[PDB]
Amino acid sequence: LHKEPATLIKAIDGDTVKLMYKGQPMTFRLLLVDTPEFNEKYGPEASAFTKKMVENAKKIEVEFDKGQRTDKYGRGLAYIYADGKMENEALVRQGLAKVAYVYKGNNTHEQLLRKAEAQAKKEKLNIWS
Ligand SMILES: Cc1cn([C@H]2C[C@H](OP(=O)(O)O)[C@@H](COP(=O)(O)O)O2)c(=O)[nH]c1=O
Numbered sequence: 027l028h029k030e031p032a033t034l035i036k037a038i039d040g041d042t043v044k045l046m047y048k049g050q051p052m053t054f055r056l057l058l059v060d061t062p063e064f065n066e067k068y069g070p071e072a073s074a075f076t077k078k079m080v081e082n083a084k085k086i087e088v089e090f091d092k093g094q095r096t097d098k099y100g101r102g103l104a105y106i107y108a109d110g111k112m113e114n115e116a117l118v119r120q121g122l123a124k125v126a127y128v129y130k131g132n133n134t135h136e137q138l139l140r141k142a143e144a145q146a147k148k149e150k151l152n153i154w155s
Pocket residue numbers: 055056057058059060097098103127129
């Protein structure tokens with residue numbers, strides 16, 4: 027997989043973000059995770075977390091997996107890095123997301139995320155509390 031540039035357009039919620047990619051605005055959905063919706067429990071915390079992460083970053087990158095790059099809503103499907111740190115993994119590690127939506131052929135970082143989920147769960151963090 028390879029990291030590609032993008033710039034923040036705007037934070038949306040825990041697992042979506044509006045970024046500029048190849049010079050075009052796109053809503054991105056974070057691969058392999060599910061944050062609560064803003065209205066659900068930990069929804070606000072997930073949203074705040076991703077927002078702080080992207081807004082504080084000097085360098086945002088997107089990394090597409092092997093399979094489909096856009097979902098049925100036209101959202102880009104990627105791993106998103108903030109100053110080299112993977113937001114998808116960070117959310118799971120903090121118990122602010124679950125590993126979810128693992129579809130064959132877009133699952134490169136599946137095991138990395140499940141390991142983070144196991145740690146979050148051990149620590150009874152947030153959603154696991
Ligand atoms: C993460 C991801 C979501 N989706 C679609 C599946 C779900 O369909 P449905 O909308 O029909 O439930 C939806 C969940 O996204 P959200 O968790 O953002 O709602 O997004 C994909 O198709 N591929 C993916 O990789």
